[PDB]
Write a protein that binds this ligand. Structure first.
Ligand SMILES: *[C@@H]1O[C@H](CO)[C@@H](O[C@@H]2O[C@H](CO)[C@@H](O[C@@H]3O[C@H](CO)[C@@H](O)[C@H](O)[C@@H]3O)[C@H](O)[C@H]2NC(C)=O)[C@H](O)[C@H]1NC(C)=O
Ligand SMILES: *[C@@H]1O[C@H](CO)[C@@H](O)[C@H](O)[C@H]1NC(C)=O
Ligand SMILES: *[C@@H]1O[C@H](CO)[C@@H](O)[C@H](O)[C@H]1NC(C)=O
Ligand SMILES: *[C@@H]1O[C@H](CO)[C@@H](O)[C@H](O)[C@H]1NC(C)=O
Ligand SMILES: *[C@@H]1O[C@H](CO)[C@@H](O)[C@H](O)[C@H]1NC(C)=O
Length: 176
């Protein structure tokens, strides 16, 4: 019921134009039959897929309470807000895709605490800050896309970031 409560909290702080969040009701024993949410055995949420679904609102600081989460996809939406710090508690995240959204703030350093991810896409956003230094600490990352964002500071070209081409990140106030 804790995961259901977290997803209900996410629903409350979000607005649905097409009404793609109606099936979410907390009365059920598990969130497994919920639409756009994928389960695994022993009823734990492992995917949260919402693409071009017109959602508008702000991210929720209770999204990080789903321990067994993977493949979080909230892209192409008018989600206006700041990336929460609680994402650092997702020890099993794989792909975090947030592109063509409108999210402000910096990229948290604690996002690098996730040691097992491979995809991290943040495109066409308006984020104010510099690239976190600790993101070098992950060696499983395969593709990175931080472009068309208010990015400033230096460019890390050591460790894993030493492998990705600079043409991945561009159109920023400061790239050097
Ligand atoms: C890739 O390069 C970046 C910087 O270009 C490295 O980040 C830096 O890592 C060093 C440790 O090697 C950090 O130094 C530490 O700073 C803290 C205070 O922040 C201090 O208490 C410690 O005693 C230590 O001196 C440094 O802060 C950090 N950031 C910057 C901007 O320098 C990163 O570790 C490199 N990754 C590699 C080599 O895999
Ligand atoms: C919902 O998304 C569609 C694109 O599939 C778009 O044409 C429509 O205008 C959107 N609805 C609203 C209210 O913005
Ligand atoms: C929501 O996003 C669409 C992009 O397709 C945009 O046209 C629309 O103005 C946005 N709604 C706002 C900013 O209220
Ligand atoms: C979840 O993340 C927050 C933000 O860093 C942290 O304070 C909290 O301790 C984390 N939860 C657990 C159970 O460690
Ligand atoms: C980002 O916005 C530009 C226009 O400013 C647009 O040309 C580009 O296609 C957008 N990025 C993506 C991935 O669609």
């Amino acid at each position: 019921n804790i995961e259901g409560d977290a997803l209900n909290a996410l629903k409350t702080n979000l607005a649905d134009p097409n009404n793609v969040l109606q099936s979410w009701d907390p009365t059920l024993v598990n969130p497994c039959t919920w639409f756009h949410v994928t389960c695994n055995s022993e009823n734990s949420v492992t995917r949260v897929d919402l693409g071009n679904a017109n959602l508008s609102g702000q991210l929720v600081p209770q999204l990080g309470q789903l321990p067994n989460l993977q493949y979080l996809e909230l892209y192409s939406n008018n989600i206006s807000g700041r990336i929460p710090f609680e994402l650092g508690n997702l020890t099993n995240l794989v792909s975090l895709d947030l592109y063509l959204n409108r999210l402000n703030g910096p990229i948290p350093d604690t996002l690098g605490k996730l040691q097992k991810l491979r995809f991290l896409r943040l495109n066409n956003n308006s984020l104010n800050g510099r690239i976190p230094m600790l993101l070098t600490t992950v060696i499983s990352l395969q593709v990175l896309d931080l472009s068309n964002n208010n990015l400033t500071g230096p460019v890390p070209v050591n460790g894993s970031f030493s492998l990705f081409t600079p043409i991945s990140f561009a159109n920023n106030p400061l790239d050097i």
